[PDB]
Amino acid sequence: KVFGRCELAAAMKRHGLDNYRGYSLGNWVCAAKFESNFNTQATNRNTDGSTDYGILQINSRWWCNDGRTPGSRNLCNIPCSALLSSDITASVNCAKKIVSDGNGMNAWVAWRNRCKGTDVQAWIRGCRL
Ligand SMILES: [Cl-]
Ligand SMILES: [Cl-]
Ligand SMILES: [Cl-]
Ligand SMILES: [Cl-]
Ligand SMILES: [Cl-]
Ligand SMILES: [Cl-]
Ligand SMILES: [Cl-]
Ligand code: NA
């Protein structure tokens, strides 16, 4: 599913990400924009042989199981495929564990490089929330 900007903001809010670990909704919408362009079915293979899954490009090295990432963990306890669902619950539940891990939203490299420090509230401007 390719979410609209405001549609994803609302879903993220409903799923408890708004100010989760102090990160405002615009931060999460911005990270989803640049990670996946709002497409839940986004996948991208990394050089280390792990793969990034879903709206927030959650990686199989630590977070989910895809069966093809040697030495990897599955700390979200989910198949990586659950991260591609039109329903974002699995992705949000996993992102909450990731943003809790110590480095906050820096764990999403596109967030650090493209969202961090910017006017992230722009990402929710206009939206009925
Ligand atoms: Cl957009
Ligand atoms: Cl915001
Ligand atoms: Cl594996
Ligand atoms: Cl494969
Ligand atoms: Cl594990
Ligand atoms: Cl699995
Ligand atoms: Cl933090
Ligand atoms: Na894994």
Curated annotation (Swiss-Prot):
SUPFAM superfamilies: Lysozyme-like (SSF53955). Disulfide bonds join 6-127, 30-115, 64-80, 76-94. In the egg white and polymorphonuclear leukocytes. Pfam families: Lys. The keyword RNA-binding does not apply. It is an enzyme of class 3 (hydrolase). PROSITE patterns: GLYCOSYL_HYDROL_F22_1, GLYCOSYL_HYDROL_F22_2. Keywords: Allergen, Antimicrobial, Bacteriolytic enzyme, Disulfide bond, Glycosidase, Hydrolase, Secreted, Signal. One of its GO terms (molecular function) is identical protein binding. Its main location: secreted. Substrate binds at residue 101. InterPro entries: Glyco_hydro_22, Glyco_hydro_22_CS, Glyco_hydro_22_lys, Lysozyme-like_dom_sf. The keyword Signal applies. Residues 1-129 form the C-type lysozyme domain. It catalyses: Hydrolysis of (1->4)-beta-linkages between N-acetylmuramic acid and N-acetyl-D-glucosamine residues in a peptidoglycan and between N-acetyl-D-glucosamine residues in chitodextrins. PANTHER family: LYSOZYME C. Lysozymes have primarily a bacteriolytic function; those in tissues and body fluids are associated with the monocyte-macrophage system and enhance the activity of immunoagents. Has bacteriolytic activity against M.luteus. Lysozyme C is capable of both hydrolysis and transglycosylation; it also shows a slight esterase activity. It acts rapidly on both peptide-substituted and unsubstituted peptidoglycan, and slowly on chitin oligosaccharides. Belongs to the glycosyl hydrolase 22 family. This is Lysozyme C.
